[PDB]
Every structure is written in structure tokens, then in C-alpha cells.
Design a protein around this ligand. Sequence first.
Ligand SMILES: O=C(O)c1cc2c(-c3cccc4[nH]ccc34)cccc2[nH]1
Ligand SMILES: O=C(O)c1cc2c(-c3cccc4[nH]ccc34)cccc2[nH]1
Lengths: 342, 342
Amino acid sequence: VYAQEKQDFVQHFSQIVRVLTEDEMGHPEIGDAIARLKEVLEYNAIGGKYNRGLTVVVAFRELVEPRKQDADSLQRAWTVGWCVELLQAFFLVADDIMDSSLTRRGQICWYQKPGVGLDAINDANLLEACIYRLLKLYCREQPYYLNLIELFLQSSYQTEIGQTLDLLTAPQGNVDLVRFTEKRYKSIVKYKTAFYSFYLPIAAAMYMAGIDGEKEHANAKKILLEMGEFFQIQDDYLDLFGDPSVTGKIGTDIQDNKCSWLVVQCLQRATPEQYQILKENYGQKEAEKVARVKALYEELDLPAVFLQYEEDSYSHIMALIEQYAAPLPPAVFLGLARKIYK
Amino acid sequence: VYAQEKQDFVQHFSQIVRVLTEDEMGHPEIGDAIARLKEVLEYNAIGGKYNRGLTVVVAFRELVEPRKQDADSLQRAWTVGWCVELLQAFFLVADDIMDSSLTRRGQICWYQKPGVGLDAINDANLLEACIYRLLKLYCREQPYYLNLIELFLQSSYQTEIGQTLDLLTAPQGNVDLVRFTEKRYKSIVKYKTAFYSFYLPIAAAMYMAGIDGEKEHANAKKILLEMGEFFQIQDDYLDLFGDPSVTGKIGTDIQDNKCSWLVVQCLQRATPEQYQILKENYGQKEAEKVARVKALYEELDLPAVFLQYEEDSYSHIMALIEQYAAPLPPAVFLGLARKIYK
Ligand SMILES: O=C(O)c1cc2c(-c3cccc4[nH]ccc34)cccc2[nH]1
Ligand SMILES: O=C(O)c1cc2c(-c3cccc4[nH]ccc34)cccc2[nH]1
């Protein structure tokens, strides 16, 4: 469903850019600013998997009657999908600055580019501003206009709350495993990742479909927030125990003192002696010390604890879909679950 | 009109904070994040003159029938005023990071506080998020709800475009006076300062009053953008030639290579020889070199050029009010003009 649509979705970015840089036509005074906005969009919104944005298009196709899927209805779906990608681009540009990252998707972080620096704070704000410009240009006259504006604003706020919670839990220069609890971990995931990655794209498609009822959204939110929790737990597991060939990424979470699912479980299972070993090696760059944590996790059989959690989670999500999908087609959630699991 | 109201406006901040930190009641998982949000609001939204926020309250009182100014109508006016102050707080926190500032209103910039740093990027985003949270909490059921959401979003976008234009014109490490033109200067002022400082607070009061017509807003915008241009030109003049006792501030614009109105005029009047002297001394910290530019400005009689510009501007604004205030009470604009001029 995603692999087919990917092409039409990615092809729509050129229109998105044209429409956003068409501001220059009526006002050539701001041309230089608009030229810069084009660079920011082209560097930061391109090069990812587009999964979150594609979820909007896929869910729109499964929620709306095919006879109501005219040229313009699909044009708005592609735009709302691109808005999800612009919300993400805004968060990533800013997160890379805050955590002093070097690369993003194997390429140099926008702020690390010569002549950019802390100016990327304004660039990230412009990416955020584009969402609302696009919603106005494409959805101003639609009955769900306000619903979409509120959903993007609430998604921004939850993610920012999640980011605060995260920054409070793992300060740069503070190696305290006492604040690394399961309850705290689950809260960071819900707010920082699960709302915008899973709930936002389905809820956007739902409003575009005329499904605006609090019950339906509460039901969809219950499935999606649980999918978001597994997604991140899996991401924290794959970070260390995942093969770097298949994943296309190499693990760093231990070196960065992250409130990872792996450390949360380790802390729950470590004896006072085992706690001390983790208290020393966690947060250090050295390949000998990083090897010690991997060995401690392996010793506490966390890959098995994960394998069990994965089976329990899939079972739970299927019961969740069964109980809360109606009146939405279960295939809306089954599509995501197939992609997230294994 | 401002001095009376200031007290009721500032007293409303405690309610604003209570209402914004009441999120913690239903969700104690995010309590730590909410505690941090309270600190950000209390440090960054307090300590200024509140002029922009007060303009909302003053204009609301002059545009709405006193019989329609019930307890709740004034409660919403105070909140919308505080939203203007939160939009400003968001821009200042971010601008201080981008231009590496040390102090703001004689106190240490939020990002410069120990244990804050680049985390202030998220804090600035939260300040921005609060506007929309307050508009929802107070104005959700009002007919101008969407009008206010769009106005704040468009004000954010114009300011960000203005900031880009500014960052492009004066790069940190690039002393090029060729890009410092009057047309560019006027564009930076319109976008970065005039829209949110003058148009936004009057337009907010106008929508709350039921005045939503494009004509009325276009007419109000014509006066307000010209007031915003004089305000900044005056600010650039006072920066150097203003008495630091009366102003309560000391000049730094020359040291920072700012696209100031003073340099724009200097460049328009400087001979090829005079251009070279400015080409050397502008952007340097040294008190001997800073004294050389002040002397060059004085030699080119820029304080007189300003004095003439000020009289021409006041004359123009009064003709503007006369031609474009109707059907609004001219006292809405006359109040601002009295405050801006002298
Ligand atoms: O970050 C990535 O590159 C990435 C995302 C994802 C997702 C994913 C995440 C959020 C919403 C989704 N909807 C549809 C897929 C998906 C799933 C699998 C691998 C993935 N890799
Ligand atoms: O920045 C300051 O401290 C400051 C603002 C101002 C303003 C001002 C600016 C924008 C909108 C306004 N509405 C009402 C007043 C006002 C005017 C005079 C001195 C000032 N000092």
C-alpha cells in the first residue's frame, strides 16, 4: 500500500515547494528569504522514508469512498502528508542542534553546514510555519480546516512536552540512573514520539474523511499510542542488538546516556553489584566500556526479555484492534502493525 | 490609558500561569515538564514594558461598546494580550541564542543560565505552543477563534521571514555594506518588527470586536506598518545619539554590524573616501573605532537628517490616520502615535 503510493507522494514535494516559494511573486523584497526557505525545505524534508506522511495518504484511501477520491481530495491528502513530514523536519533540525549531533540520515546535520550554525533555529521555525501556510492554501474552504490546525498544534505541544521530559531525564553531564524508571520511559515515548508518529497521521486522515467524533479518535489513539510504545522499545533494542546491515544504522545509545528501554529493564533486574558496573560504563565513549554494558545486558538475558515483550505486544495490539478499530476498517491499523512488527 | 490598565494586565499573568500549569492535574506523569514550563513563562514573559500586550486591552476597550465589556470579554482581552507577550518571549529567547547575546532587560539571557543552554530552543517552542493553548482555553467558543489562530500563525511566519532576511543581510563574520540598502532595511523592519509589534495587537482587538473585514484590516495595516517603520528608525537613532539615562540602554549597534537606519543613511551620503572609513571601523569592538563612526555620522549631519525625518513621519502618520482610521475611532491610532513620538 506504501511502496506503490511512495512515488506519487515524493513527486508532490516539487508542487509543495513551488506553492511555498510562490510568496516571492507578489513580494520580491523577501526573495532572498524565500530562496533560503527553498534550501531548508529541500535539505531537511527530503531523504527519509516518508512513512509518517505516507500513513496520511494510505489511511485517506482506506477511510474515504473511492468515488469521493477525486483529483483535489488526493491533492489535499498528499499535502497533509507533507505537513506531517514538515512537522518532523522541524523537530529533527532542532533536536540535532540541542543534542549536538553530527549527522542525520548519513548526511551532515543542517546546523553543522558551513554558514548555517544557530541560524538553523529560525530555519526550524520556518519549517513549522509552512504546515499552516499549506493547510491554508489547500484546506481553507474544507469543513475539517480547524480540526487539522488544532491537531498539528496539539501534536507540536505534546512532542515539545516529551522533549522537555527527555532533556530533564538525561542531562548532558548528569549520569543518574535513578530518574530512569519504566513509568518515566513510557511517558517520554508517549509524548515525544507516539503522538506525532502514529496518532497525528491517522487522525489527520480521519478528519479529512469526516470522522471527527471524540469516541472514534479516543479509540484510534488507544491502538496507535500502544503501537508507538512498541515502535520505540523495538528501536532501543535494535540500536544495540540489531544487525547494522539490515537496520542500516550503528548503535550509540549507551555512549549518549539515553533513557533507553534496555537500561530501564537492566536497572529493574540488576543486583546492587550489577547496578555499580552499569553506573560506571554507561555514558562513556570507549569501545571497551561500551562492550561491558552489551555483555551485562546479554548476561541479564534482555534479548530474551525483548523477544517475550514483542510476542506479548503483538498479541495485545491485535486484541486492541479487535476491540477499538470499529467503525474504522481494521486494515488501517493492520497495515501499520505489519510494518512495525518484524 | 496604558498606565491605568498595566496593573490588571500584569495581575492576570498569575491566572495565565495557573491555567497553563493545570495540565499536571489530569496527567501527573508530565509534572516535571510542567514545572519547567512554569519557570520558562515566569523568567521570559515577565520584566518587560508589556506595551504590545497592553495595546490589545486598550484597543479592545476603545473598539467594543462598554455594555459588551463584561467580566469574560475583558478576561479574553487580557489573555489575548498575554498571547502577544508570549509570541514576543518566544522570538526573544530564540534571537538571544542566535546572536549570542549575554543579557536581556539587564538580566542574563535564559539560554545563558547554568543548566539551560541549547535546551532553550525547546523552551522557546513551548512559549510559542502556549499561545494556541490559551486561545483554545479562552476563545474556543468565540466567533473570531479561527481569525485569532490565523493572525498569530501569520505574525509568526512574517517575523521568521524578517529574521531570515536580517540573518542573510548581516552574517556574523561578514562586513559587507553593499547589502545594506534602504529598500532592504525597510523590508527587514516590516517583516521582523512592524507586523507583530503594531499590526498583530490592533488586529487581534479588531477581530475580538467583530471587525473582520479585509478593507478595515488593510486600512489599519497601512497606518500601523508606517508607525512600525518610524519606531525602529527611532530605536536605531536613540541607540547611538540617545541619552543612556532617559533611554535606560547603552549603544552597541556599530560593534554588531547591524543593518541600522544610521548606516543606511551614512552609506547614501558617504563619498568614496568616507565609505572606506566606515568600511574599516564598522563591526569592531574597540572604543576608539566606535568613536570614529559616531564622529562620521555627526559629520554627515545624520542627527539633523533624523530630526527632519521625525517631523516628516509625524506629519505623514496624521494624514494616514485622517485617511484610513474610519470607521475605527482615531484615538486607537492616536494613542500609539503619542507613545511612539518623542
Ligand atoms: O524512521 C524511520 O526511517 C522509520 C519509520 C518506520 C516505521 C513507521 C514509523 C511511524 C509511522 C509509520 N507509518 C508507517 C510506517 C511507520 C515502520 C517501520 C520502519 C520505520 N523506519
Ligand atoms: O521594547 C520596549 O521596551 C518598548 C516598546 C515601546 C513602545 C511600543 C512598541 C510597540 C507597540 C506599542 N504599543 C504601545 C506602545 C508600544 C512605545 C514606546 C516605548 C517602547 N519601549
